[PDB]
Amino acid sequence: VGMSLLALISIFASCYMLVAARSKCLTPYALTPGAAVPWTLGILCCAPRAHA
Amino acid sequence: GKRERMCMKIENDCIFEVKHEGKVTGYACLVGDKVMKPAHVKGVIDNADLAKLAFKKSSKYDLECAQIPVHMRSDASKYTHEKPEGHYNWHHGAVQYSGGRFTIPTGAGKPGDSGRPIFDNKGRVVAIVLGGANEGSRTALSVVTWNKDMVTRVTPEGSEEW
Amino acid sequence: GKRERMCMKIENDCIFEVKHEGKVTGYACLVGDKVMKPAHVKGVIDNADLAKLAFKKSSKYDLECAQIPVHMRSDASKYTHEKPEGHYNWHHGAVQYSGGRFTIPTGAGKPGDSGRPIFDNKGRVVAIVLGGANEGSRTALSVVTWNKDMVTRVTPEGSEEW
Protein backbone atom coordinates (compact mmCIF):
# COMPACT_ATOMS: atom_id res chain seq x y z
CA VAL A 1 0.00 0.00 0.00
CA GLY A 2 2.85 2.38 0.79
CA MET A 3 4.57 1.83 -2.55
CA SER A 4 1.30 2.17 -4.46
CA LEU A 5 0.40 5.35 -2.58
CA LEU A 6 3.83 6.84 -3.33
CA ALA A 7 3.45 5.89 -6.99
CA LEU A 8 0.10 7.68 -7.25
CA ILE A 9 1.30 10.82 -5.46
CA SER A 10 4.25 11.23 -7.83
CA ILE A 11 1.95 10.68 -10.81
CA PHE A 12 -0.52 13.21 -9.41
CA ALA A 13 2.32 15.65 -8.76
CA SER A 14 3.65 15.12 -12.29
CA CYS A 15 0.19 15.69 -13.74
CA TYR A 16 -0.11 18.76 -11.51
CA MET A 17 3.09 20.29 -12.90
CA LEU A 18 2.05 19.62 -16.51
CA VAL A 19 -1.24 21.50 -16.13
CA ALA A 20 0.47 24.34 -14.26
CA ALA A 21 3.07 24.68 -17.02
CA ARG A 22 0.23 24.79 -19.54
CA SER A 23 -1.47 27.62 -17.64
CA LYS A 24 1.72 29.66 -17.25
CA CYS A 25 2.72 29.35 -20.92
CA LEU A 26 -0.79 29.60 -22.41
CA THR A 27 -2.03 32.64 -20.48
CA PRO A 28 0.49 35.09 -22.05
CA TYR A 29 -0.31 34.13 -25.65
CA ALA A 30 -4.06 34.16 -24.97
CA LEU A 31 -4.77 37.47 -23.26
CA THR A 32 -5.66 39.84 -26.13
CA PRO A 33 -4.84 37.74 -29.22
CA GLY A 34 -5.72 34.33 -30.55
CA ALA A 35 -2.29 33.37 -31.88
CA ALA A 36 -0.37 30.25 -30.92
CA VAL A 37 2.19 29.44 -33.62
CA PRO A 38 0.35 26.47 -35.12
CA TRP A 39 2.18 23.75 -33.20
CA THR A 40 5.57 25.06 -34.33
CA LEU A 41 6.00 26.67 -30.90
CA GLY A 42 2.91 24.96 -29.45
CA ILE A 43 4.71 21.65 -28.88
CA LEU A 44 8.20 22.68 -27.79
CA CYS A 45 7.05 25.35 -25.32
CA CYS A 46 4.03 23.92 -23.49
CA ALA A 47 0.78 22.02 -24.02
CA PRO A 48 -0.60 22.76 -27.53
CA ARG A 49 -4.00 21.59 -26.28
CA ALA A 50 -5.45 25.08 -26.80
CA HIS A 51 -8.46 24.94 -29.12
CA ALA A 52 -7.74 27.85 -31.47
CA GLY B 1 -9.61 73.57 -25.28
CA LYS B 2 -12.51 71.48 -26.60
CA ARG B 3 -10.62 69.08 -28.87
CA GLU B 4 -12.15 65.92 -27.35
CA ARG B 5 -14.21 64.03 -29.93
CA MET B 6 -12.08 60.89 -29.93
CA CYS B 7 -13.00 57.23 -29.43
CA MET B 8 -13.71 57.89 -25.74
CA LYS B 9 -17.06 59.42 -26.70
CA ILE B 10 -17.52 56.90 -29.53
CA GLU B 11 -17.38 53.85 -27.25
CA ASN B 12 -18.27 55.46 -23.88
CA ASP B 13 -19.44 52.12 -22.43
CA CYS B 14 -16.53 49.64 -22.34
CA ILE B 15 -15.90 50.88 -18.78
CA PHE B 16 -17.77 48.56 -16.40
CA GLU B 17 -16.84 50.38 -13.15
CA VAL B 18 -16.02 47.27 -11.14
CA LYS B 19 -17.53 47.83 -7.70
CA HIS B 20 -16.64 45.79 -4.62
CA GLU B 21 -19.56 45.62 -2.18
CA GLY B 22 -20.94 48.50 -4.24
CA LYS B 23 -17.72 50.55 -4.04
CA VAL B 24 -16.20 51.23 -7.46
CA THR B 25 -12.62 49.96 -7.18
CA GLY B 26 -11.60 49.24 -10.78
CA TYR B 27 -12.60 49.50 -14.44
CA ALA B 28 -12.97 46.65 -16.93
CA CYS B 29 -12.71 47.08 -20.70
CA LEU B 30 -12.72 44.93 -23.85
CA VAL B 31 -10.16 44.35 -26.59
CA GLY B 32 -10.47 42.06 -29.61
CA ASP B 33 -12.94 39.41 -28.42
CA LYS B 34 -11.31 39.56 -24.96
CA VAL B 35 -12.11 41.33 -21.69
CA MET B 36 -9.38 43.16 -19.76
CA LYS B 37 -9.67 43.47 -15.99
CA PRO B 38 -6.85 43.76 -13.41
CA ALA B 39 -6.47 40.64 -11.29
CA HIS B 40 -5.32 42.39 -8.11
CA VAL B 41 -8.54 44.41 -7.98
CA LYS B 42 -11.87 42.78 -7.19
CA GLY B 43 -15.53 43.70 -7.12
CA VAL B 44 -18.86 43.28 -8.88
CA ILE B 45 -19.07 42.25 -12.54
CA ASP B 46 -22.78 43.10 -12.59
CA ASN B 47 -23.05 42.69 -16.36
CA ALA B 48 -24.58 39.22 -16.53
CA ASP B 49 -22.60 38.27 -19.64
CA LEU B 50 -19.32 39.20 -17.94
CA ALA B 51 -20.42 38.16 -14.45
CA LYS B 52 -20.61 34.44 -15.30
CA LEU B 53 -17.26 34.29 -17.14
CA ALA B 54 -14.02 32.70 -15.94
CA PHE B 55 -10.81 34.76 -15.87
CA LYS B 56 -7.17 33.92 -15.31
CA LYS B 57 -5.40 35.50 -12.33
CA SER B 58 -1.74 35.37 -13.37
CA SER B 59 0.00 37.68 -10.90
CA LYS B 60 2.98 38.01 -13.25
CA TYR B 61 0.59 39.93 -15.52
CA ASP B 62 -2.16 40.76 -12.99
CA LEU B 63 -4.75 40.54 -15.77
CA GLU B 64 -8.13 38.85 -16.26
CA CYS B 65 -8.45 37.79 -19.89
CA ALA B 66 -11.73 36.38 -21.20
CA GLN B 67 -13.74 35.33 -24.26
CA ILE B 68 -16.49 37.95 -24.55
CA PRO B 69 -19.67 37.12 -26.53
CA VAL B 70 -21.00 39.11 -29.49
CA HIS B 71 -22.92 41.22 -26.96
CA MET B 72 -19.90 43.58 -26.77
CA ARG B 73 -18.20 42.88 -30.12
CA SER B 74 -19.60 46.19 -31.36
CA ASP B 75 -19.30 47.89 -27.95
CA ALA B 76 -15.55 47.30 -28.23
CA SER B 77 -12.31 49.28 -28.40
CA LYS B 78 -9.52 48.75 -30.91
CA TYR B 79 -5.98 48.19 -29.65
CA THR B 80 -2.36 48.29 -30.79
CA HIS B 81 0.83 46.27 -30.44
CA GLU B 82 2.97 49.34 -31.22
CA LYS B 83 3.69 52.49 -29.21
CA PRO B 84 4.43 55.75 -31.08
CA GLU B 85 6.17 57.38 -28.12
CA GLY B 86 4.45 60.63 -27.19
CA HIS B 87 1.04 61.78 -25.96
CA TYR B 88 -1.95 59.47 -25.54
CA ASN B 89 -5.54 60.04 -24.46
CA TRP B 90 -6.67 59.43 -20.88
CA HIS B 91 -9.88 59.54 -18.84
CA HIS B 92 -8.90 61.67 -15.83
CA GLY B 93 -6.35 63.69 -17.80
CA ALA B 94 -3.70 62.86 -20.40
CA VAL B 95 -0.89 60.35 -20.94
CA GLN B 96 2.73 61.46 -21.35
CA TYR B 97 4.70 58.49 -22.70
CA SER B 98 8.36 59.40 -22.43
CA GLY B 99 11.01 57.15 -23.91
CA GLY B 100 10.03 53.70 -22.68
CA ARG B 101 8.14 54.96 -19.63
CA PHE B 102 4.55 55.97 -18.94
CA THR B 103 3.83 58.97 -16.72
CA ILE B 104 1.15 61.52 -15.87
CA PRO B 105 1.33 65.00 -14.34
CA THR B 106 2.53 64.90 -10.75
CA GLY B 107 -0.35 64.43 -8.33
CA ALA B 108 -2.82 63.92 -11.18
CA GLY B 109 -5.27 61.04 -11.24
CA LYS B 110 -5.71 58.98 -8.09
CA PRO B 111 -5.13 55.51 -6.59
CA GLY B 112 -7.66 52.72 -6.33
CA ASP B 113 -8.75 53.16 -9.97
CA SER B 114 -6.66 50.49 -11.69
CA GLY B 115 -8.36 49.92 -15.03
CA ARG B 116 -8.51 53.29 -16.82
CA PRO B 117 -8.37 52.10 -20.45
CA ILE B 118 -5.84 54.68 -21.60
CA PHE B 119 -6.51 55.78 -25.18
CA ASP B 120 -4.26 56.76 -28.07
CA ASN B 121 -4.34 60.01 -30.03
CA LYS B 122 -5.71 58.09 -33.04
CA GLY B 123 -8.77 56.90 -31.11
CA ARG B 124 -7.50 53.46 -30.09
CA VAL B 125 -6.11 51.60 -27.07
CA VAL B 126 -2.42 51.13 -26.32
CA ALA B 127 -2.22 50.73 -22.52
CA ILE B 128 -4.18 49.94 -19.37
CA VAL B 129 -3.35 51.49 -16.00
CA LEU B 130 -2.30 49.26 -13.11
CA GLY B 131 -0.38 51.36 -10.58
CA GLY B 132 1.29 54.70 -9.90
CA ALA B 133 4.72 55.89 -8.74
CA ASN B 134 4.98 59.47 -7.46
CA GLU B 135 8.67 60.29 -7.61
CA GLY B 136 10.05 63.69 -6.70
CA SER B 137 10.20 64.53 -10.40
CA ARG B 138 6.85 63.28 -11.72
CA THR B 139 4.36 60.41 -11.55
CA ALA B 140 5.10 57.07 -13.22
CA LEU B 141 2.70 54.13 -13.23
CA SER B 142 2.60 50.37 -13.66
CA VAL B 143 0.71 49.42 -16.83
CA VAL B 144 0.26 46.57 -19.32
CA THR B 145 1.19 46.64 -23.00
CA TRP B 146 1.11 44.20 -25.92
CA ASN B 147 4.13 43.04 -27.91
CA LYS B 148 3.85 41.61 -31.43
CA ASP B 149 2.23 38.50 -29.92
CA MET B 150 3.26 38.44 -26.25
CA VAL B 151 0.96 40.25 -23.82
CA THR B 152 3.62 41.65 -21.50
CA ARG B 153 3.55 44.09 -18.58
CA VAL B 154 5.69 46.88 -17.11
CA THR B 155 5.90 48.04 -13.49
CA PRO B 156 8.23 50.99 -12.75
CA GLU B 157 10.14 50.90 -9.49
CA GLY B 158 8.39 52.51 -6.54
CA SER B 159 4.96 52.07 -8.14
CA GLU B 160 2.10 51.10 -5.81
CA GLU B 161 -1.32 49.67 -6.61
CA TRP B 162 -3.63 52.35 -8.03
CA GLY C 1 -24.92 61.33 -47.97
CA LYS C 2 -23.83 60.21 -51.44
CA ARG C 3 -20.24 58.97 -51.07
CA GLU C 4 -20.54 55.54 -52.72
CA ARG C 5 -18.42 55.29 -55.88
CA MET C 6 -16.18 52.47 -54.67
CA CYS C 7 -15.33 49.06 -56.13
CA MET C 8 -18.89 47.89 -55.40
CA LYS C 9 -20.17 49.76 -58.46
CA ILE C 10 -16.96 49.21 -60.45
CA GLU C 11 -17.47 45.43 -60.46
CA ASN C 12 -21.24 45.26 -59.77
CA ASP C 13 -21.37 41.63 -61.02
CA CYS C 14 -18.85 39.57 -59.02
CA ILE C 15 -21.89 38.75 -56.89
CA PHE C 16 -24.04 35.96 -58.32
CA GLU C 17 -26.94 35.27 -55.90
CA VAL C 18 -26.53 31.55 -55.30
CA LYS C 19 -30.10 30.18 -55.33
CA HIS C 20 -31.38 26.96 -53.76
CA GLU C 21 -34.59 25.91 -55.54
CA GLY C 22 -34.46 29.44 -56.96
CA LYS C 23 -34.29 30.92 -53.44
CA VAL C 24 -31.20 33.12 -53.08
CA THR C 25 -29.48 31.78 -49.95
CA GLY C 26 -25.91 33.08 -50.33
CA TYR C 27 -23.53 34.92 -52.64
CA ALA C 28 -20.48 33.96 -54.71
CA CYS C 29 -17.64 36.36 -55.54
CA LEU C 30 -14.35 36.35 -57.43
CA VAL C 31 -10.91 37.19 -56.04
CA GLY C 32 -7.64 37.15 -57.98
CA ASP C 33 -8.24 34.17 -60.31
CA LYS C 34 -10.24 32.35 -57.60
CA VAL C 35 -13.97 32.04 -56.89
CA MET C 36 -15.20 32.18 -53.29
CA LYS C 37 -18.42 30.57 -52.10
CA PRO C 38 -19.54 29.74 -48.53
CA ALA C 39 -19.55 26.00 -47.91
CA HIS C 40 -22.44 25.79 -45.44
CA VAL C 41 -24.80 27.41 -47.97
CA LYS C 42 -26.00 25.68 -51.13
CA GLY C 43 -28.05 26.37 -54.22
CA VAL C 44 -27.68 27.25 -57.91
CA ILE C 45 -24.42 28.37 -59.53
CA ASP C 46 -26.19 28.94 -62.86
CA ASN C 47 -23.17 30.63 -64.45
CA ALA C 48 -21.81 27.84 -66.63
CA ASP C 49 -18.14 28.47 -65.83
CA LEU C 50 -18.93 28.25 -62.11
CA ALA C 51 -21.87 25.83 -62.39
CA LYS C 52 -19.70 22.87 -63.48
CA LEU C 53 -16.81 23.58 -61.09
CA ALA C 54 -15.57 21.42 -58.22
CA PHE C 55 -15.02 23.02 -54.80
CA LYS C 56 -13.50 21.89 -51.54
CA LYS C 57 -15.81 21.69 -48.52
CA SER C 58 -13.43 22.19 -45.59
CA SER C 59 -15.91 22.99 -42.83
CA LYS C 60 -12.95 24.13 -40.72
CA TYR C 61 -12.96 27.16 -43.04
CA ASP C 62 -16.50 26.85 -44.48
CA LEU C 63 -15.41 27.99 -47.93
CA GLU C 64 -15.50 26.62 -51.49
CA CYS C 65 -12.29 27.51 -53.30
CA ALA C 66 -12.12 27.31 -57.09
CA GLN C 67 -10.29 28.41 -60.23
CA ILE C 68 -11.87 31.01 -62.53
CA PRO C 69 -11.24 30.94 -66.31
CA VAL C 70 -9.68 33.81 -68.26
CA HIS C 71 -12.88 35.09 -69.87
CA MET C 72 -14.32 36.01 -66.45
CA ARG C 73 -11.07 37.42 -65.03
CA SER C 74 -12.11 40.64 -66.78
CA ASP C 75 -14.77 40.69 -64.03
CA ALA C 76 -12.48 40.35 -61.00
CA SER C 77 -12.07 41.90 -57.55
CA LYS C 78 -8.77 42.82 -55.93
CA TYR C 79 -8.07 41.87 -52.33
CA THR C 80 -5.76 42.45 -49.37
CA HIS C 81 -3.77 40.45 -46.83
CA GLU C 82 -3.43 43.35 -44.36
CA LYS C 83 -6.23 44.77 -42.21
CA PRO C 84 -6.08 48.50 -41.41
CA GLU C 85 -8.49 48.25 -38.48
CA GLY C 86 -11.27 50.78 -39.02
CA HIS C 87 -14.28 51.31 -41.26
CA TYR C 88 -14.85 49.30 -44.44
CA ASN C 89 -17.46 49.13 -47.18
CA TRP C 90 -20.52 46.88 -47.23
CA HIS C 91 -23.52 46.10 -49.42
CA HIS C 92 -26.25 46.47 -46.78
CA GLY C 93 -24.52 49.22 -44.76
CA ALA C 94 -21.11 49.89 -43.20
CA VAL C 95 -18.31 47.98 -41.47
CA GLN C 96 -16.88 48.89 -38.05
CA TYR C 97 -13.70 46.81 -37.85
CA SER C 98 -12.85 47.12 -34.19
CA GLY C 99 -9.71 45.50 -32.83
CA GLY C 100 -9.55 42.19 -34.67
CA ARG C 101 -13.35 42.08 -34.86
CA PHE C 102 -15.78 42.61 -37.70
CA THR C 103 -19.15 44.06 -36.69
CA ILE C 104 -22.16 45.98 -38.02
CA PRO C 105 -25.03 47.93 -36.40
CA THR C 106 -27.60 46.22 -34.19
CA GLY C 107 -30.16 44.44 -36.33
CA ALA C 108 -28.62 45.69 -39.57
CA GLY C 109 -28.51 43.32 -42.50
CA LYS C 110 -30.14 39.91 -42.20
CA PRO C 111 -29.43 36.17 -41.92
CA GLY C 112 -29.53 33.73 -44.81
CA ASP C 113 -27.18 36.04 -46.74
CA SER C 114 -23.84 34.48 -45.88
CA GLY C 115 -21.45 35.63 -48.59
CA ARG C 116 -21.64 39.45 -48.79
CA PRO C 117 -18.09 40.03 -50.12
CA ILE C 118 -17.30 42.94 -47.81
CA PHE C 119 -15.33 45.65 -49.60
CA ASP C 120 -12.43 47.84 -48.51
CA ASN C 121 -12.57 51.63 -48.24
CA LYS C 122 -9.86 51.68 -50.94
CA GLY C 123 -12.12 49.81 -53.37
CA ARG C 124 -11.03 46.21 -52.77
CA VAL C 125 -12.17 43.07 -50.92
CA VAL C 126 -10.88 42.35 -47.40
CA ALA C 127 -13.53 40.04 -45.93
CA ILE C 128 -16.37 37.69 -46.86
CA VAL C 129 -19.31 37.34 -44.47
CA LEU C 130 -20.20 33.86 -43.26
CA GLY C 131 -22.37 34.13 -40.17
CA GLY C 132 -23.99 36.67 -37.89
CA ALA C 133 -24.46 37.17 -34.18
CA ASN C 134 -27.09 39.43 -32.59
CA GLU C 135 -26.90 39.37 -28.80
CA GLY C 136 -28.27 41.94 -26.36
CA SER C 137 -26.80 45.30 -27.37
CA ARG C 138 -25.29 45.07 -30.86
CA THR C 139 -24.19 42.70 -33.62
CA ALA C 140 -21.11 40.67 -34.56
CA LEU C 141 -20.51 38.13 -37.32
CA SER C 142 -18.38 35.23 -38.50
CA VAL C 143 -16.17 36.01 -41.50
CA VAL C 144 -12.98 34.91 -43.28
CA THR C 145 -9.67 36.77 -43.53
CA TRP C 146 -6.35 36.03 -45.23
CA ASN C 147 -3.01 36.15 -43.42
CA LYS C 148 0.29 36.66 -45.25
CA ASP C 149 -0.27 33.36 -47.08
CA MET C 150 -2.64 31.17 -45.06
CA VAL C 151 -6.41 31.59 -45.43
CA THR C 152 -7.84 31.65 -41.91
CA ARG C 153 -11.34 32.18 -40.49
CA VAL C 154 -12.83 33.84 -37.41
CA THR C 155 -16.13 33.04 -35.68
CA PRO C 156 -17.20 35.06 -32.61
CA GLU C 157 -18.69 33.04 -29.77
CA GLY C 158 -22.45 32.67 -29.95
CA SER C 159 -22.63 33.44 -33.68
CA GLU C 160 -25.40 31.79 -35.71
CA GLU C 161 -25.43 31.07 -39.43
CA TRP C 162 -26.54 34.14 -41.39
Residue pair B49/B117 in contact by the 8 Å Cβ criterion: no
Residue pair B19/B44 in contact by the 8 Å Cβ criterion: yes
Partner-chain contact A35 B58, CB within 8 Å: no
Residue pair C25/C112 in contact by the 8 Å Cβ criterion: yes
Cα separation of B16 and B44, whole Å?
9
Q: Where are the beta strands (DSSP E) in chain C?
A: 18-20, 23-26, 29-31, 34-36, 87-89, 94-96, 103-104, 128-129, 131-134, 139-140, 143-144, 160-161
Q: CA torsion sign, A38 to A40 to A41 to A44?
A: positive
Cα separation of B141 and C92, whole Å?
45
Comparing CA positions, the residue from A21, A1, A23, A25 lying closest to residue A13 is A21
Residues of B with CB under 8 A from a CB of A: 31-34, 36, 56, 58, 61, 63, 65, 79, 146, 149-152
Q: Nominal resolution in Å?
A: 3.7
Partner-chain contact B34 A35, CB within 8 Å: no
The experimental technique used to determine this model is cryo-EM
Note if B91 is an active site residue.
no
Cα separation of B73 and C141, whole Å?
9
Q: Is C85 on the interface with B (CB under 8 A)?
A: yes
CA trace torsion A28, A32, A38, A44 (10° rounding): 0
Minimal Cβ distance to C98: which of B49, B69, B76: B76
Note if C159 is an active site residue.
no
Contacts of B10 (CB under 8 A, 6+ apart): B123
